[PDB]
Copies of this chain bind each other. A is one copy, B any other.
Amino acid sequence: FSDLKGKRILITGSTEGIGMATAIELARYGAVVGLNSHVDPADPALLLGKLREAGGDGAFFRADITKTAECQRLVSAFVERFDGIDVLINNAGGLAGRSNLENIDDAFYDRVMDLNGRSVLMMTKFAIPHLRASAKASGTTSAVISTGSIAAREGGGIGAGVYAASKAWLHDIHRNWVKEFTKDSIRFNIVAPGTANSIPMGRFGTVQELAPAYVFFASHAASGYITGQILDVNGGQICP
């Protein structure tokens, strides 16, 4: 993954969990990583230290990407700082509460779909021209990676229907983006985490077991001929 050195990678929802672990793993190969959350972390400089300690660089950008204006602002701020985008990682998302169908109102639907649907759509939209520029300059490809879910495939847990559907939504919109943007040499791939006795490996995954898949999809040398794919990382929980 020597081709990740100096690559400018914007990761949404990356101050904790999978996003932060991915940021660090990418930074180990010299990536320049834009961290993001809707809230300021306790110690932003510490996160930056971990990126630089690993061998890369970066910055933290606060932005609430449930709002389209904020997606625009985040992309513009990242490009102002680093002069472009080589990889976008759509990682921000989540359940945003649980509700059986009969208790779902407009507010609940809006909340879940803004977090998991509108955010990914608009982040990607605003990143496209920068990703297009990146691939043109490098003569290789640029990349989008999005965090999917097992729930996209088998409906998710009771009360998590809208969330599950939003991930199926994501998995399929990537297929559309392959059709539109492969001509621009932009690749699109998904890492789909699982959720214990329904898991063949008999345990939940750790963030360290998720990060390498993102690194793989980020590197043109590793995955340059790979686009429109979903790699499920779930200890065998589903074998699609």
Contact = CB atoms under 8 A, between A and B. Distances in A.
Contacts of A156: 172, 175-176
Interface string A199-240: 011100110011011001000011111111111111110111
Most buried by B among A201, A225, A228: A225
A155 B169 contact: no
Contacts of A164: 172-173, 175-176
Nearest to A161: B176
Contact of A239 (B105, B160, B183, B229): B229
How many identical chains are in the complex?
4
A165 interface: yes
A33 B159 CA distance: 31
Interface string A31-71: 00000000000000000000000000000000000001000
Given A155-B179, A213-B223, A228-B239, 13 more contacts: A101-B180, A151-B172, A152-B168, A153-B172, A154-B239, A164-B172, A174-B239, A210-B225, A212-B216, A213-B222, A225-B234, A226-B233, A229-B240
Nearest to A167: B172
Contact of A121 (B124, B162, B216, B228): B162
Interface residues of A, number: 76
A128 interface: yes
A231 B229 contact: yes
A168 B178 CA distance: 16
Contacts of A179: 155, 157-158, 200
A182 B169 contact: no
B117 A101 contact: no
5 contacts: A101-B181, A109-B118, A155-B176, A212-B221, A216-B222
B235 A225 contact: yes
A106 interface: yes
A216 B164 CA distance: 27
A107 to B, nearest CB: 10
A222 B227 contact: no
Q: State the 5 A-B residue pairs at the shortest beta-carbon distance, nearest first.
A: A155-B175, A228-B239, A168-B172, A161-B176, A182-B200
